[PDB]
């Protein structure tokens, strides 16, 4: 009861803030908070590119577990679409091109929320020390191009823009 001293003992909605019943809308609005000393910049994308899918997944799991252990707010841990390159090698005596093989490179991206300069230095040192063989590591800021890389093209939108121009 409101007048009883035990009022609000069942108050629980302030202990949890996950009340977003939306279909799939994402925020994607964390600007880099750069205040000079507490340089808590924005979300960062860590890309791991590898031909070996198992190795790429293993290193993505390792870096995600390391982020969880180091109290790093991991925004996402997803996979970009694979790229399948075809090798066309020039046959002996020249003037020919034959199919050699196909290489499917896979990219695993971990989106982290916030970080500081010293901890970023330590984290980069650890990552580059524990990097496996034949894996490309990239550390970037989350931009609109990176966000749209996962999404597919818009041929109709491009045609409409071309007609407008």
């Amino acid at each position: 009861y409101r007048s009883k001293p035990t009022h609000g003992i069942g108050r629980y909605k302030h202990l949890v803030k996950a009340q977003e019943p939306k279909k799939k809308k994402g925020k994607v609005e964390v600007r880099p908070i750069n205040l000079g000393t507490d340089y808590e910049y924005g979300v960062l994308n860590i890309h791991l590119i590898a031909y070996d899918m198992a190795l790429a997944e293993s290193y993505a799991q390792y870096v995600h577990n390391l982020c969880n252990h180091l109290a790093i707010k991991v925004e996402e841990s997803y996979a970009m679409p694979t790229k399948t390159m075809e090798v066309l090698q020039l046959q002996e005596q020249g003037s020919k091109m034959f199919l050699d093989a196909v290489l499917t490179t896979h990219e695993r991206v971990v989106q982290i929320s916030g970080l500081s300069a010293t901890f970023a230095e330590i984290f980069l040192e650890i990552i580059h020390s524990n990097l496996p063989e034949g894996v490309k590591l990239s550390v970037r800021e989350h931009t609109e191009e990176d966000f749209k890389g996962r999404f597919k093209a818009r041929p109709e939108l491009e045609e409409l823009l071309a007609k407008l121009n």
Binding site: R2, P5, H7, G8, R11, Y12, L15
Partner: peptide, 29 residues
Amino acid sequence: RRAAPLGPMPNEDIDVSDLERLKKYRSFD
């Protein structure tokens, strides 16, 4: 009308602000 609690509240120790940095238990056990 409001009355003062006769002792400490159960969930008054944990901080409401910055829930993401507070560890949770994910086990019903």
